[PDB]
């Protein structure tokens, strides 16, 4: 919703209020998304002043508010900002900003990251390239200085966050991307690495002075249809934690494999299948192992850009032996969405 | 304050700074409402997109930014989201809401929850029925399928909230209301009941596999005066702490008795009386005992739409014997208010 | 942003996003600023309604949202509401307003907090009359009801805050400044005194039933040219920690110095100079030690009123050999800001 638009500057406030649950076996323990009430909001704001013909200035800041929490003790609980960034754009030449942004191996991951619910496992908050994090450079070009039309690329500075917790720390690093797209065909690199930090290594699951991070994708999207592909692999990278050892660190190898089919009816219907696979290799006294594992299976019910609804099904593959305690059970989510 | 009006939708973003004193004899330790700094804010979105000619979506959010901590480690105190859901409404048919929204009892106790600070003492937080609840799925049927002007009536799922804390929790449970307003005059009922948790049963003060909550309303609303009543009660659903044995859980059975007089005078000035009873018994290791007892009197000037100010007066008649330990001390709060 | 202009009320939306490094020499844990992801960002409202001809009402509410955390359960490190107040103003007879607020010793040393990112390091948050504090009620009158153009008092009341911790509280009491602006110059004096509270004389730093504090202040504002001075005294107001002891309190006594040069170009650069040197006086198993000491050299690039960029680098003075562990590196800041 744009609240002022004036002398060039303007700005739009956005948010959204999130009616969520999820089913599962039990108390969701040993399932995929767990269960019970998982309602939430979001609030931010967007804006772009035009300082001359050639220079763009920006800033973004997104939070999200969840609402499945008493007004008690609990209260923050899963709250956080998602983003905050500021920046400066110029003509056809690129961008720079800095701040809390989405790491540039995600610009590969998007690609799959469509699904009504779930999706997008290998794409980590705070986890290096492959979400959002913290602290991040990004130079960014689109169609190429102006002369290509759909070629964009990206190089990203990565700052090290030395935090309480191997899981949210990282060193400094470097990544980038490139894609490429023609009338609903896309095609996507992305690569990153970093240092990881002392007590990153102090952990028992991975090994290595380096993160290393990166993914492929194509895609098709027109005729109200959606295809998707990505492809990654990860050194030293991806989170994991053994539930039977209640140890944790890094996964040594990942090999990730995911897959969308979407369809779009003209009534607001969008159905929508998924196949994803992550697999774990060289992990600590265990070899092998799935981290995720499932297909999905849902639908998104458009009333307008601004009210839906929605039901994801993760029929999940992982089994009951799985040597991390990774959950076997399945999850369904429903929910009823408006936004701004 | 309306931020989007285009193509159906629209949207308001409000909000409150309210400046708010708290004086009680000592520390307030051993009074109605405490004492000291109690300043707080409100920031809340509201929006509404017509889909069709019968068929609306909508969506909520509301924040509590409590003005009285410091900047330190006490910074997010008592900071919470008040309510965040979404729904549709559809012609004469109905309305459905879910996420975090107000139970269907306070459909009947809203009646007197109108002083200009305190009052509204049954309608607690994360409580069944009976104040703000997460995960709750409402239907709400307005003139009745639009047949009669004035009839109402509600019913509500709740959906089972497994907390850290028996306080904040409940099981399933199902309710309703209805009501009926003929110019001026109003009448209401409304009905909830639950299971309750296992830790909710493992706590010494209540006992029972099923919570309870009931109240019936009456109000006067016309002629710049403004009457009402309330009367409910409950089982194993009001919550209750042992000040002396540091214990705490629920009352197997309270009786509550609202009452609340005001008069609005054109300038802008609107006194106000109200008297509140709530009582609890077979509460065990003590009988029956007064929760809520005293005579309200105060004030707010209302200088327009945006701005006022307040004071109210909590004349309490618990006494020094009180066998749970409540307070037994007067509190005056003032305040001055602006609102968008 | 004006969000809302009719029948007398409006309201402005207000924020920025701040992408933001220091670089200190190690962890920073040895340097005046730290170092590391800075970024942060701000959201905030400010009202005001025309009640009648001669009475203005007002509200306003900011608050702070650190974007260098993660989205695990460090989230929240450092979110706080910075302001929350309302008020009426009175034609030429005075405002009144209560909330949290900028105590009345920040109407002198407002003159000196103006370098891009670090100074006004005697500005403590929730510290009596110098920084933004809870629960103060502030009595403004401009112009010397309406008398005297450029002439300034105030006078405020500080309730008690008996707050967890020794740092953040505060007992009753009282101050005021008085100022005067002419054509660019400008002088002010302000003076506060408070009680201490029983957990405060508990510390081993600091001993005194009242704290106090008092600065004075002079500027030349014109031509492009900036120019301020601070003076400062404290007496048992000024928070200090021993590093060494792992012990925490008040200084018994503060002198404070405070200096600024800026000169603003027409193309938008800001260059700034600065020295700041506090020193306490009378500290337990201590004497006399600098809490600050540096020279600031930096400059802001302002692209307009919504863009801008800054360095700021601060060349400290303080030594190794400081007796309460003060950091003694030096720290840069880099930042870009949008805000609107
Ligand atoms: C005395 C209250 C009358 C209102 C009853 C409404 C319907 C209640 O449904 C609750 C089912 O449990
Ligand atoms: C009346 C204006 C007084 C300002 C004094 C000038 C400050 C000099 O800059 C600080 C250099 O160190
Ligand atoms: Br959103
Ligand atoms: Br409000
Ligand atoms: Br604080
Ligand atoms: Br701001
Ligand atoms: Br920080
Ligand atoms: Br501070
Ligand atoms: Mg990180
Ligand atoms: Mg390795
Ligand atoms: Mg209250
Ligand atoms: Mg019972
Ligand atoms: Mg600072
Ligand atoms: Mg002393």
Not at 120 to 126: K, N, Q
Not at 202 to 219: D, H, S, V, Y
Not at 233 to 258: C, H, M, W, Y
């Amino acid at each position: 919703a744009e609240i002022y638009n004036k002398d060039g500057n303007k700005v739009d406030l956005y948010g959204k209020a999130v009616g969520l649950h999820y089913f599962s076996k039990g108390n969701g323990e040993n399932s995929y998304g767990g269960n019970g009430d998982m309602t939430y909001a979001r609030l931010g704001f967007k804006g772009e002043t035009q300082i001359n013909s050639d220079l763009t200035g920006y800033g973004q800041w997104e939070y999200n508010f969840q609402g499945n929490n008493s007004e008690g003790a609990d209260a923050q609980t899963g709250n956080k900002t998602r983003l905050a960034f500021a920046g400066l754009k110029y003509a056809d030449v690129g961008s720079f900003d800095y701040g809390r942004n989405y790491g540039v191996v995600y610009d590969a991951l998007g690609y799959t990251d469509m699904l009504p619910e779930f999706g997008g496992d290998t794409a980590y908050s705070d986890d290096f390239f492959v979400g959002r994090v913290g602290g991040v450079a990004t130079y960014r070009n689109s169609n190429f200085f102006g002369l290509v039309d759909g070629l964009n690329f990206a190089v990203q500075y990565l700052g090290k966050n030395e935090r309480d917790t191997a899981r949210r720390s990282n060193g400094d690093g470097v990544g980038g991307s490139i894609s490429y797209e023609y009338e609903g065909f896309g095609i996507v690199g992305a690569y990153g690495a970093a240092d990881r930090t002392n007590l990153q290594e102090a952990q028992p699951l991975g090994n290595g002075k380096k993160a290393e991070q990166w993914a492929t994708g194509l895609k098709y999207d027109a005729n109200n249809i959606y295809l998707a592909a990505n492809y990654g692999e990860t050194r030293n990278a991806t989170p994991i934690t053994n539930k039977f050892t209640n140890t944790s660190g890094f996964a040594n190898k990942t090999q990730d494999v995911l897959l969308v089919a979407q369809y779009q009816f003209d009534f607001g219907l969008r159905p929508s299948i998924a196949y994803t696979k992550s697999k774990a290799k060289d992990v600590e006294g265990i070899g092998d192992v799935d981290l995720v594992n499932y297909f999905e299976v849902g639908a998104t019910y458009y009333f307008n850009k601004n009210m839906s609804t929605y039901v994801d099904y993760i029929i999940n593959q992982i089994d009951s032996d799985n040597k991390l305690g990774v959950g076997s059970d399945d999850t369904v989510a429903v929910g009823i969405v408006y936004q701004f």
